[PDB]
């Protein structure tokens, strides 16, 4: 189906004369495959996934070269953003950045991204047309003008519409047993006694990939959203993901409730009921 | 603001390292280095997209750079360069891959030995009398001879003031002996004026040639005068 | 990523209109035009961005390809001042500029009344010391170089007496040889017999 490649950069300034912290990780869909850490001893772009280890020295020496430049250009941005907001040198601030491309089912380009953040808040971001910029505040407005003058948008669009989907298509085909795979949820539901009158039915969804999933609790009517409890989708640590939804029910009426599970691996939605 | 290179002319012995300086105040993050042979194009040596980071070019062998400061981008010509003699250019853009602004450039010439260095001899040639009668206007000629290296600046001076009108000069000098590697050079120039003015003995003409040679640092143990950076001149007055 | 320019060398007469091309198989986000005089730093002329863009600088006229793969430099009423190397530059992916090998343009002047004559000048200081001034010749004729080891022949040079609109061509040869003569200089080259 639809796929994506994402790069996440985290630049954190250290108080005083402590060298800035830089972290860069790469994600294809929901799978991380590369990393870079400024506090590491290797000082190279490292493989996280085994399927990207196919690449020879030229790739890794190249990716190492380009990410070093990404670190230095962000060390500068930390200082520049400090001046824009009149901040002291004593405090610690964070600069974040993401760019990547989205493809269709036929792997044709769909969407491109390029965003910035400072101290947890949006700074400047490339609009969907890949022609304009969204500058939140008057400080970012300076960057917007600087990038409009140097025409950064056009050259970025070439990468997103072109080189990005070229890279993603390479990654998808190199290790297709890992990226193109779809692991279906292994579902079950457990029953628990709350005091005595009420009871908790928890619908479990385990060992599934991709991470996108929908768990709803429905009665004989339909979809009882609210009262039901939902938790954030969590990684199992083996590449797969976990998530459960639960709702408290009166005793005996446990047979009335059902759990709907929708996933990419599921050809049809699953309707699960509790039977004593 | 602008982008500068210093010096304009540069001369070294064979195998001794030299560092060229390109500095800016245009607030640019990217700085570039190109070398240009005579009648040739630009060849990228080294370039830095951002401070504290640089990368090789097409012809980066024999060179080394540093980008510790945003303002400058020093190019070091190592002794390992097979053909150091070229015309070097530094450029910079507000960001990498965008429009670059070039510096004035620097001419570097590396010789086998300092003995081949010679100052130019300047001679002013007075207008042929056959010309005045024929074309009703006169032509002055200057001629620099036997100078090495190829680092000279020629100018014409009328009555203490420099003139550019009615002036022409060779774009390229001439090798007196092309067979030799460190061959000496020769250059010619022209100044054409009306017959009326050269007929006037109140007007002074002067062909000035600035030469860039050796320094006080270099030692010159020879029996001819030390070919330092000097001005060679020749003058001529009006006739009838 | 390659930028090709045609023609390599162009030598046309003063006052006419020309066009220099810069073609590439690659797409460019931005393209620059430079003009370099010998021994000096290239001067930025223009930066084109949008496809089909048309921009003018003095007499220069720049055109950007619709697919942003081609560019053209049009000079209107060419003057001898336009003489120089015209370079095509495009945004390289590796954080650099891709350069063309340039078009060397030679705008030759339209001399009104050709007066081809060979003169002999003597040093202001002393003698012998004599040179030959081959001057006031037409643009089309070309002064070939030397062959005698003593004889040194310079190339043509165009000076402009801006007093009242007058330009001219000139050439210089010299020797220390006793048998060096004005009539036997430049004979290695084809010159008009209307001396």
């Amino acid at each position: 189906g639809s796929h994506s490649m994402r790069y996440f950069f985290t630049s954190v300034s250290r108080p005083g004369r402590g060298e800035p912290r830089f972290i860069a990780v790469g994600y294809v869909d929901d799978t991380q495959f590369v990393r870079f850490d400024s506090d590491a001893a290797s000082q190279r772009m490292e493989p996280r996934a085994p399927w990207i280890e196919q690449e020879g020295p030229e790739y890794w020496d190249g990716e190492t070269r380009k990410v070093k430049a990404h670190s230095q250009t962000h060390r500068v941005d930390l200082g520049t953003l400090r001046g824009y907001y009149n901040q002291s040198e004593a405090g610690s601030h964070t600069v974040q950045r993401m760019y990547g491309c989205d493809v269709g089912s036929d792997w044709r380009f769909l969407r491109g991204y390029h965003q910035y953040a400072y101290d947890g808040k949006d700074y400047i971001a490339l609009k969907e047309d890949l022609r304009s910029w969204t500058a939140a505040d008057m400080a970012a407005q300076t960057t917007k003008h600087k990038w409009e003058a140097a025409h950064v948008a056009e050259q970025l669009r070439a990468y997103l519409e072109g080189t990005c989907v070229e890279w993603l298509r390479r990654y998808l085909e190199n290790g297709k047993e890992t990226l193109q795979r779809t692991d279906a949820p292994k579902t079950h539901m457990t029953h628990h006694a709350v005091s005595d009158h009420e009871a908790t039915l928890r619908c479990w969804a385990l060992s599934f990939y991709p991470a996108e999933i929908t768990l709803t609790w429905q009665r004989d009517g339909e979809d009882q959203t609210q009262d039901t409890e939902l938790v954030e989708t969590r990684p199992a640590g083996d590449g797969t993901f976990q998530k459960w939804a639960a709702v408290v029910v009166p005793s005996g009426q446990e047979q009335r409730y059902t759990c709907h599970v929708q996933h990419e691996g599921l050809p049809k939605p699953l309707t699960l009921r509790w039977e004593p | 603001g602008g982008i500068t290179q210093s010096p304009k002319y540069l001369f070294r012995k064979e195998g001794q390292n030299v560092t060229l300086s390109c500095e800016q105040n245009l607030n640019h993050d990217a700085m570039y280095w190109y070398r240009q042979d005579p009648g040739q194009g630009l060849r990228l040596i080294y370039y830095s997209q951002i401070v504290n980071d640089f990368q090789k070019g097409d012809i980066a062998e024999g060179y080394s750079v540093s980008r510790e400061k945003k303002e400058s981008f020093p190019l070091t010509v190592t002794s390992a360069q097979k053909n150091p003699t070229a015309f070097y250019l530094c450029a910079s853009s507000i960001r990498s891959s965008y429009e670059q602004y070039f510096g004035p450039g620097t001419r570097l010439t590396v010789t086998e030995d300092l003995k081949n260095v010679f100052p130019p001899e300047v001679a002013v040639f007075e207008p042929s009398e056959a010309e005045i009668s024929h074309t009703q206007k006169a032509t002055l000629v200057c001629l620099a001879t036997g100078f090495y290296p190829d680092h000279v600046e020629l100018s014409w001076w009328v009555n203490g003031k420099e003139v550019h009108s009615g002036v022409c000069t060779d774009p390229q000098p001439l090798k007196e002996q092309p067979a030799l590697n460190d061959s000496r050079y020769a250059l010619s120039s022209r100044l054409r004026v009306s017959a009326t003015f050269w007929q006037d003995p109140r007007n002074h003409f002067r062909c000035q040639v600035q030469f860039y040679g050796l320094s006080e640092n270099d030692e010159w143990t020879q029996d001819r005068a030390k070919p330092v950076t000097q001005i060679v001149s020749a003058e001529a007055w009006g006739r009838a | 990523q390659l930028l090709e320019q045609s023609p390599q060398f162009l030598s046309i007469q003063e006052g006419e209109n020309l066009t220099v091309y810069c073609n590439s198989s690659s797409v460019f986000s931005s393209l620059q035009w430079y003009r370099q005089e010998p021994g000096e730093g290239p001067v930025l002329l223009v930066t084109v961005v949008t496809g089909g863009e048309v921009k003018k600088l003095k007499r220069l006229t720049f055109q950007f390809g619709d697919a942003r793969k081609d560019s053209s430099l049009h000079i209107t009423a060419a003057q001898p001042g336009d003489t120089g190397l015209y370079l095509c530059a495009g945004a390289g992916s590796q954080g650099n500029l891709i350069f063309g090998k340039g078009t060397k343009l030679s705008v030759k002047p339209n001399i009104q009344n050709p007066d081809p004559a060979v003169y002999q000048l003597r040093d202001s200081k002393s003698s012998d010391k004599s040179v030959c001034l081959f001057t006031d010749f037409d643009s089309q004729t070309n002064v070939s170089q030397s062959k005698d080891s003593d004889v040194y022949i310079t190339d043509k040079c165009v000076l402009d007496m801006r007093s009242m609109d007058f330009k001219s061509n000139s050439a210089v040869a010299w020797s220390n040889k006793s048998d060096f003569a004005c009539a036997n200089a430049f004979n290695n080259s084809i010159i008009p017999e209307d001396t």
């Binding site: 990404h70 250009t73 520049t80 760019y99 700074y123 | 993050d29 951002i50 960001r95 990498s96 | 590796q94």
Partner: peptide, 9 residues
């Protein structure tokens, strides 16, 4: 693959 050209803020 990451970007091959960098630009300050």
């Amino acid at each position: 693959g990451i970007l091959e050209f960098v630009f300050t803020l």
